[PDB]
Ligand binder design. Structure first.
Ligand SMILES: [Cl-]
Ligand SMILES: [Cl-]
Ligand SMILES: [Cl-]
Ligand SMILES: [Cl-]
Ligand SMILES: [Mn+2]
Ligand SMILES: [Mn+2]
Ligand SMILES: [Mn+2]
Ligand SMILES: [Mn+2]
Ligand SMILES: [Mn+2]
Ligand SMILES: [Mn+2]
Ligand SMILES: [Mn+2]
Ligand SMILES: [Mn+2]
Lengths: 440, 440, 440, 440
């Protein structure tokens, strides 16, 4: 599953439909990024630029011109074809092939952007620009506007209005097309297979980074070369560190390991967390904390639907957590009073859910306290956790336990679809899986 | 093998020994780097900062103060310990533990750098600063100097002299300690095992990126989490593109695949290229080009020693190439005349060797045309190649063939040691390896 | 005559009336400017900031908030009162006195602008900002918007729309109130008295800068401390250099001197040019060129009225010039053909008229080729000139003659009012004035 | 008196003599400065650039190359000759005439600086650059060094050492040549004539700015077009504000007026303060404060000589002030105890003396608390003052009195020469002068 040329074109037209007549929208590619000295990180296209193009080169700018309410056209600035650069660093789309390949009306060399952009903006009323996103893009836009402001003797005029297109575009991204959902479904399946593999390979004495290697190998073999975020493999006390990415420790018999990892597939993020015993068997204490986190997740999965909100479902989770922690003696008091004082927060200190898409923490307005009413087409995570610090003032057997369990879902007309339920999370199913792998 | 605290301290003292009395050297950590939106790339410490510290955090600055010819001391600025940041994003060294851990005299919070740096530079004659390396570092240094210049009423004085320490430090890095050579030896072995694995796993119909996944998995399992540069897997015509990193094509029965990949192990780069038949058997044409590149490499490996140079060895390679290409009819004419007109250059268009170390294209002065005389302790690559474009005006059977074969060596008192000879390169040994793997 | 508090308030309200509901306009003061080292030029307030405030301090920002269509209010950021700064550098308005003095609703310390501006912009739809006018102002606005964009967890929202208020404000400035016309009338009278004085004081052997001194002394004595632009005193060949400001030469018996000078009175510019014989008597050649320039000006003064344009009046001037130059043999050919080839341009190479107000080259849209139809309340200059280079291919006696004659006018319902006719320009009146002064 | 070509050349050679072999010094012109919109302030050349050139154009850079200990040469970058720019904005020196005019070896177009500077710095060991002085200059230098650092394949090398030439050059400027002293002597005489004129013209009912106009007219007529700093005319309570430049008030019968004004003559500053009765007659109270300030100045003038210091002479002044203030009841206590508690500071809150030259607050190291031992050739001001605030807790008759009296001196082998004693300061001489002028 992928997003095709025709869909990128639909998205461009949908933006144009929201634009004022006599306007242009400017969407810039990500800069290349240095890793060390002359070596660069593998290129990651800007998500919004990607959303409108599926084009994975730097030094590119998409310009959508809406001349009036019936007439509009697109211009791409992109790197020229060049024999030498290409023998060295790889093939480039160039200007001749871009209109057909990407479905844009015209393509021009990026090297000509300062000579051409002001001419495209001349006489328009509005420019849509994500100001502050990239310095290089701001310099280009500001230069063009300055040329226009200062060019009345050449009969040039600058648009007086600049509108940040990010609110509009991010609202577009918040609601996934069926094709986007198919891509995310595949991302979830690829990520789930990776997590299953990690559970089947995990043994005491392996390093945390060994499970990262298994996971990334599984991503790669399904054509998801890169993770959507830095993989977390937190065994023992490291599980209580939320974005532990060192993954440098030997995994001990008797500890849990929390793995949070997700692929990037055709631009889209998977995002799964599973926590499991390194030796294949939960201790009583581990199981007691695990069951509360799993109940939180299972309840959330039953509830998420159109018409509720992250805030509302979070309230149910908080009650489940406070109740379970009181029962174990980790919290003490009256449940409702404890809820009223947010007594869960030392152990569950993050949000239950974030939007998911071209970024793992995807764009889109949440509303105050994530109160926005859910509608079909929204994609979000569900990730309750409990983290009991090594020095927490709690019954000793719970200290140093960090558990999160995270699935990715799409809101549908009838509730939700779980994209990541193909990797197990019930404790008895985890143990069975690991027992089977451990027998060879 | 690794580099220890005591060695980082030796390097600091060796810099200090080269410093003027009444001076301070400022060495800044790399900034964190955005991958997309709020997600960052896995952190890569600046190589020179690493060289003096082995410390893998951002927002850190090493200050070496040489008060006079007998007295000197070190101050580290680094991130404070902070409960919340640490629960979220991970553990930090902090100020209390840094002096013992890193072997510095004093540690201060990075948040205090603007309040403290000018006081450390007050009254010194010289500041050593790699100006232009990082914008954030330049801002900090320029602010401190401005405070001093403008603070005569507070009895402050700025050092009038600023010296770029990069020439001195890069000359230090050019000559490896025995411990560094041990680390590089391990990098070479890890990288070689990865390349062997790729040869054993490769089958027609696999995607180029599948071999990248095998390679990166092998790096990881030996504790080299990250590659030292973006892996190249160039099959068929893609082999003629020097830094082909798309690795997106299905590998065809009958094509060669060129794999250029290297691990980063304790900061140090491996860098190996092997080219081999996708189906396990060189065609006659492939073998004919391969033999010229292999002869170039084997001859270079015999020759490299103290007292020669990359330039001198390159001349021998050029003769081997021109000779072989004439013999095959790819070039036509008199060998010596062809050499005199650099007739090899359409097919061998890059350098034979680059320095290797904490960067894959390592620091250090090459001399004009890489004429610097080699000495023991220098580490370099040897990477002849021949690339015959799909449309080259040559006998048809050679078109679209891209071959490079690259080993990493250390110059020793008696010649060189090949760090990467544990992965095969003789064509009959490649075929035997692949025949054996292909039988299961 | 001046502009009062109530008028600045009217202007603020007129801007607000043009603003969208749910918006704020930000108007920044000019930065102080270094002359040398720690010495600054005398402060000149930004013209648009001045237009809305009459406030002559730096580090000030006017914020006009239009909450909706009935409710609006103003906030000033300005320097705090401070005993020491004030003993040293002078009195400051401060926060307590500003609301009454300036007629703003609230005043806050400039030192708090970054802590307060984002709170004023939170939740608005539109921000009006003259982007690119000042770097310091851009930094402040961009920081505030970034805080808002990034502050959704604090329930902050940034306005997505930024509109340059300069087009609207400059259209306001283009049409003068009766009070503004009274100020400009006084500026014209002060400037005229200065030019009369220069004519009465001028003698061969005086330096050009001596007339500048007379002029600036006369400005000052009427309470116009500063000129509105750098004074030009171009004698002999220097008259052919349009913005000759060196004023360094001894004025010779037999040469003309061109003086272009204007006062700045309550923010408003005068702008007068007179050219006259250094020795009090035009030569025949000088008089011949002078008469053409004077005819051009007198005709322009008869013509300028509502319903014509600078372009239309320029055409009449061009015909007068071509005709006169043909008659003298400076041009040769058919007048209409010469006009059609713009043959006057080597001798008259600038515009006839520019708008006049708070800047000498005042703001406001001219239309293509200055074709905008004139309306009452517009204020402009009328400044024909002829400049015959020392090496021009023309009858010898005309070489090195530079003449401009410039008056300032206001368009009225019935034509125009000449604000600067109190300094003579008819050649016989110039000679009479100078003859009288030269007798003592 | 002026500074000639040969002296600018001597200064260049004296810098070169202090430079390391294999080095270049870069001295940049001041940028032009905006006054409002498209109008600029009258150009003021950077003092250090002026010191080495006497050249009053922007977009110019002096490059002094010291190839080794015997061979050196100079290159100027400066604006090209251009017909149109010159018809408009004035004459430019250009490249052809510069070597002879300025006495430099070579001149190149400023437009070529980025193409040429790196070639001049290639292979040198040291670059002398006043980093942080001007942004435009820093950009140019940083670009050149970056080209060199990154150009090893083109056999380019950057100098690793950058030295701020300001300490060396400012020490040069601290010691005046006999020619510089002659220029300063003339500056002092011009300034003194201006102050005499102000005393002779001053009448109750005139505005403070009227005396500014008289002063600036007198500067101008002697060929000092511009003041060296913004003129202060502080009558009544305004005299207690140290840099009162508003000069906006009507001068009252019964008040003193403090005038601090100085010309700029051939680049060099005068700096004189005189305080006198607006009505020509000191009141008893005014005279009582005046006598203490005059005693302070007369004593300082007797004392200043080689071998003393500003600090030492300041101590004598402080004693004079404390003594006089005790005698009048403004201070109460034991003189020595009062001195020990710096009890004078509410009334005398600034320094007694600053260096004087191409800047009014001239460059040069003062030593801690201005303790540097004075030597012949140093030029400084002597400016005791007493300022009694309107609300000071002192005998009523002294409130609102601000008096400073300031002369400019040169240290000589035998003491000092007073450059500004030609304007009176004894109270009886002030009254006599004013009585005579007031009679007509
Ligand atoms: Cl391009
Ligand atoms: Cl910190
Ligand atoms: Cl403030
Ligand atoms: Cl130029
Ligand atoms: Mn996750
Ligand atoms: Mn998540
Ligand atoms: Mn390689
Ligand atoms: Mn290599
Ligand atoms: Mn004018
Ligand atoms: Mn004009
Ligand atoms: Mn003074
Ligand atoms: Mn002074």
């Amino acid at each position: 599953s992928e997003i095709s040329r025709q869909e990128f074109q639909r998205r461009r037209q949908a933006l144009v439909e929201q634009m004022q007549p006599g306007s242009a929208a400017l969407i810039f590619a990500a800069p290349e990024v240095t890793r060390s000295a002359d070596s660069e990180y593998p290129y990651r296209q800007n998500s919004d630029f990607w959303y409108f193009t599926g084009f994975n080169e730097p030094e590119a700018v998409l310009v959508l011109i809406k001349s009036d309410d019936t007439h509009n056209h697109s211009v791409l600035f992109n790197r020229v074809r060049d024999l030498t650069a290409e023998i060295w660093f790889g093939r480039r789309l160039g200007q001749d092939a871009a209109p057909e390949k990407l479905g844009v009306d015209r393509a021009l060399a990026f090297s000509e952007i300062n000579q051409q952009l002001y001419q495209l903006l001349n006489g328009l009323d509005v420019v849509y620009h994500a100001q502050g996103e990239y310095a290089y893009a701001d310099v280009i836009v500001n230069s063009a506007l300055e040329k226009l402001r200062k060019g009345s003797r050449q009969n040039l005029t600058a648009p007086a209005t600049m509108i940040d297109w990010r609110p509009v575009v991010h609202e577009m991204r918040l609601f996934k097309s069926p094709e986007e959902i198919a891509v995310l479904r595949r991302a979830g399946e690829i990520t789930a297979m990776a997590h299953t593999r990690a559970m089947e390979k995990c043994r005491p004495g392996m390093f945390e980074y060994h499970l990262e290697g298994e996971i990334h190998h599984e991503f790669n073999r399904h054509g998801a070369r890169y993770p959507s975020y830095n993989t977390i493999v937190g065994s023992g006390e490291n599980g209580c560190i939320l974005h532990y990415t060192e993954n440098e420790c030997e995994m001990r018999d008797g500890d849990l390991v929390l793995i949070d990892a997700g692929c990037e597939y055709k631009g889209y993020a998977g995002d799964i967390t599973r926590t499991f015993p390194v030796n294949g068997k939960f201790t009583q204490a581990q199981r007691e904390i695990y069951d509360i986190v799993l109940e939180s997740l299972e309840t959330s999965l039953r509830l998420y639907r159109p018409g509720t909100s992250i805030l509302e479902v979070t309230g149910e989770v908080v009650r489940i957590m406070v109740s379970g922690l009181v029962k174990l003696g980790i919290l003490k008091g009256d449940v409702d009073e404890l809820i009223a004082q947010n007594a869960h927060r030392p152990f569950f200190m993050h949000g239950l859910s974030h939007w998911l898409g071209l970024d793992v923490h995807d764009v889109g307005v949440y509303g105050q306290d994530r109160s926005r009413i859910l509608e079909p087409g929204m994609v979000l995570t569900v990730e309750p956790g409990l983290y009991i610090a090594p020095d927490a003032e709690v019954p000793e057997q719970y200290r140093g336990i960090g558990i999160r369990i995270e699935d990715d879902i799409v809101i549908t007309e009838t509730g939700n679809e779980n994209l990541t339920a193909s990797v197990v999370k019930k404790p008895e199913e985890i143990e069975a899986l690991m027992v089977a792998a451990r027998k060879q």
